[PDB]
Amino acid sequence: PTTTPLK
Ligand SMILES: *[C@H]1O[C@H](CO)[C@H](O)[C@H](O)[C@H]1NC(C)=O
C-alpha cells in the first residue's frame, strides 16, 4: 500500500 492524502 501507499499513502497519498488529498484534502
Ligand atoms: C500510493 O502511492 C502509490 C505510488 O504510485 C500509488 O499511486 C497508489 O495508488 C497510492 N495509493 C493510494 C491509496 O492513493
PDB file of N, CA and C and ligand atoms in Angstrom:
ATOM      1  N   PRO A   1       0.831  -1.233   0.000  1.00  0.00           N
ATOM      2  CA  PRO A   1       0.000   0.000   0.000  1.00  0.00           C
ATOM      3  C   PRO A   1       0.854   1.266   0.000  1.00  0.00           C
ATOM      4  N   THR A   2       0.236   2.390  -0.348  1.00  0.00           N
ATOM      5  CA  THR A   2       0.950   3.661  -0.386  1.00  0.00           C
ATOM      6  C   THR A   2       0.046   4.797   0.083  1.00  0.00           C
ATOM      7  N   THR A   3       0.598   5.686   0.901  1.00  0.00           N
ATOM      8  CA  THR A   3      -0.167   6.816   1.415  1.00  0.00           C
ATOM      9  C   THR A   3      -0.022   8.025   0.497  1.00  0.00           C
ATOM     10  N   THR A   4      -1.132   8.713   0.252  1.00  0.00           N
ATOM     11  CA  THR A   4      -1.115   9.888  -0.612  1.00  0.00           C
ATOM     12  C   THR A   4      -2.341  10.759  -0.356  1.00  0.00           C
ATOM     13  N   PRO A   5      -2.419  11.345   0.808  1.00  0.00           N
ATOM     14  CA  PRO A   5      -3.559  12.214   1.203  1.00  0.00           C
ATOM     15  C   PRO A   5      -3.952  13.182   0.090  1.00  0.00           C
ATOM     16  N   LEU A   6      -5.183  13.682   0.155  1.00  0.00           N
ATOM     17  CA  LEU A   6      -5.670  14.617  -0.852  1.00  0.00           C
ATOM     18  C   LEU A   6      -6.921  15.335  -0.356  1.00  0.00           C
ATOM     19  N   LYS A   7      -6.727  16.308   0.529  1.00  0.00           N
ATOM     20  CA  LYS A   7      -7.848  17.064   1.076  1.00  0.00           C
ATOM     21  C   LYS A   7      -7.380  18.426   1.579  1.00  0.00           C
TER      22      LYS A   7
HETATM   23  C1  LIG B   1       0.023   5.190  -3.114  1.00  0.00           C
HETATM   24  O1  LIG B   1       1.024   5.707  -3.962  1.00  0.00           O
HETATM   25  C2  LIG B   1       1.319   4.742  -4.946  1.00  0.00           C
HETATM   26  C3  LIG B   1       2.554   5.196  -5.725  1.00  0.00           C
HETATM   27  O2  LIG B   1       2.320   5.041  -7.117  1.00  0.00           O
HETATM   28  C4  LIG B   1       0.123   4.629  -5.895  1.00  0.00           C
HETATM   29  O3  LIG B   1      -0.109   5.885  -6.516  1.00  0.00           O
HETATM   30  C5  LIG B   1      -1.119   4.214  -5.104  1.00  0.00           C
HETATM   31  O4  LIG B   1      -2.264   4.305  -5.938  1.00  0.00           O
HETATM   32  C6  LIG B   1      -1.289   5.142  -3.899  1.00  0.00           C
HETATM   33  N1  LIG B   1      -2.368   4.661  -3.045  1.00  0.00           N
HETATM   34  C7  LIG B   1      -3.409   5.434  -2.750  1.00  0.00           C
HETATM   35  C8  LIG B   1      -4.474   4.816  -1.851  1.00  0.00           C
HETATM   36  O5  LIG B   1      -3.529   6.585  -3.172  1.00  0.00           O
END
